[PDB]
Design a protein around this ligand. Structure first.
Ligand code: HEM
Ligand SMILES: CCCC[C@H]1CC[C@]2(CC[C@H](C)[C@@H](C/C=C(C)/C=C/[C@H](O)[C@@H](C)/C=C/C(=O)O)O2)O[C@H]1/C=C/C(C)=C/C(=O)O
Length: 393
């Protein structure tokens, strides 16, 4: 075992990845990391190693329960979500929920997201520069979508935004905030669930309630924890990615310009930005080896955790030529920005649609878009990206 390195590596600001990732990915075998909490772990940074750990069934998410897992947050809720499980329980839960999220299902949302984006832009223009691209655009878009899909009132977004912020915090200042704010959110969601039981609506929460109450296909806690997981993943991810994508395109303005000239390139460009633009401030959730297994030149013994550095793997020059360059037309772009295998992002079709429409509207309406102040990047959070992003035009 190599001496453990402190992790996460950072940085928080901009789109760079720490040189420590490059060094690790260049080095034979896996490296060892120690996070603020839990046991030390292996870190996988090469593309092939990442995909083995994420997609080979000899690695487990469920086994985490037998451990004090490597992590940046003190509280481990051990939620009953599909993401914390292996087959067959993962399969059961995903099978029920995924119908709401397929390309085929979410496509009807495209004009709705399009129209919302344009209305938000109308409002930014009416006010006058500067706008905050986060508060005025990037946050409302995905929040509106997940609220309407799940059945969580958009009017409550200040409340649940506060809880989300606390739950995502990796700050040692007030280390109990995540745990107690999750309790607040649990009570809130419980209230919504009770409302829908008394009177169902055309939303995913009501659908899951039927799956449990009528079909006995999931437990009460599974129901609760999927409401929570989907609400948070449903908005915070996209809300971070929109401004980061825009920053990438404006920071190297040849890319913004190419998309102005060639809007048909938007889907390809969005894939390249999912490859390049980091979402996590640190790695994928740990996977535990079920049995001894060789990974990237290292024997990972049964019971040992491996963290997958998605962002670093996405810049593996063994797989992606000129990996540190954005190439909007990059071919066979099978990045792992949405993961890979069993826990591949359920929200990927929705995220893709959201990012495509968010960029399309800004490119159409604000071709002269520019950063117009200090970008406050999220710091000491599970996610990376601008918290506020002053823009002009
Ligand atoms: C830019 C937007 C998004 C990105 C980059 C993203 C990224 C990811 C990644 C990398 C994973 C796998 C993590 C791992 O294996 O350790 C994942 C899983 C997941 N994501 Fe997304 N996500 C995004 C948006 C969304 C949205 C809108 C939803 C909708 C609620 C969502 C729901 C989920 C769920 C339920 C899983 C777990 C799937 C499973 O365990 O089978 N995500 N996401
Ligand atoms: C519904 C299940 C969604 C889970 C994915 C969300 C997206 C993503 C992309 C890669 C990133 C490195 C992580 C960052 C972590 C996030 C967004 C955590 C959110 C929060 O903990 C949600 C899932 C809370 C659930 C709860 O039950 O409290 O997030 O990866 C996944 C989250 C991994 C986590 C929380 C790993 C961990 O905690 O070790």
């Amino acid at each position: 075992y190599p001496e453990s390195l402190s992790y996460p590596f950072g940085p928080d600001e901009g789109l760079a990845l720490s040189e420590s990732y490059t060094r690790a990915r260049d080095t034979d075998g896996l490296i060892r990391v120690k996070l603020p909490y839990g046991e030390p772990a292996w870190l996988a940074t090469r593309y092939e190693d990442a995909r083995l750990v994420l997609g080979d069934a000899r690695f487990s998410r469920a086994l985490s329960e037998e451990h004090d897992p490597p992590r940046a947050r003190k509280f481990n809720a051990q939620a009953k979500s599909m993401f914390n499980m292996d087959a067959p329980d993962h399969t059961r839960l995903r099978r029920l929920i995924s119908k709401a999220f397929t390309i085929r299902r979410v496509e009807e949302l495209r004009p709705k997201v399009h129209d919302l984006a344009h209305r938000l832009i109308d409002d930014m223009l009416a006010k006058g520069e500067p706008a905050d691209l986060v508060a005025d655009y990037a946050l409302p878009i995905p929040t509106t979508v997940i609220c309407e899909l799940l059945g969580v009132p958009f009017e409550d977004r200040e409340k649940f935004g506060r809880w989300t912020d606390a739950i995502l915090s990796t700050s040692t200042l007030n280390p109990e905030e995540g745990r107690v704010k999750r309790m607040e959110l649990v009570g809130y969601i419980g209230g919504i669930i009770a409302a829908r039981r008394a009177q169902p609506a055309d939303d995913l929460i009501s659908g899951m309630i039927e799956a449990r109450d009528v079909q006995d296909k999931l437990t009460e806690q599974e129901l609760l924890d999927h409401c929570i997981g989907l609400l948070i993943a449903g908005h915070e991810t996209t809300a971070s990615q929109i401004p980061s994508f825009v920053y990438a395109l404006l920071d190297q303005p040849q890319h913004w310009k190419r998309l102005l000239d060639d809007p048909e390139l938007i889907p390809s460009a969005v894939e390249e930005l999912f490859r390049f633009v980091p979402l996590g401030s640190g790695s994928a959730a740990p996977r535990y080896a079920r049995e001894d297994i060789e990974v990237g030149g290292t024997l990972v013994r049964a019971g040992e955790p491996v963290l997958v550095a998605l962002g670093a793997a996405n810049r593996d020059g063994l797989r992606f030529e000129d990996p540190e360059e954005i190439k909007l037309d990059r071919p066979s772009n099978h990045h792992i920005g949405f993961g890979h295998g069993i826990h591949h992002c359920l929200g990927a079709p929705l995220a893709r649609l959201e990012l495509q429409e968010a960029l399309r509207a800004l490119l159409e309406r604000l071709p002269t878009l520019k950063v117009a102040g200090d970008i406050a990047w999220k710091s000491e959070m599970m996610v990376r990206g601008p918290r506020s992003m002053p823009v002009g035009w």
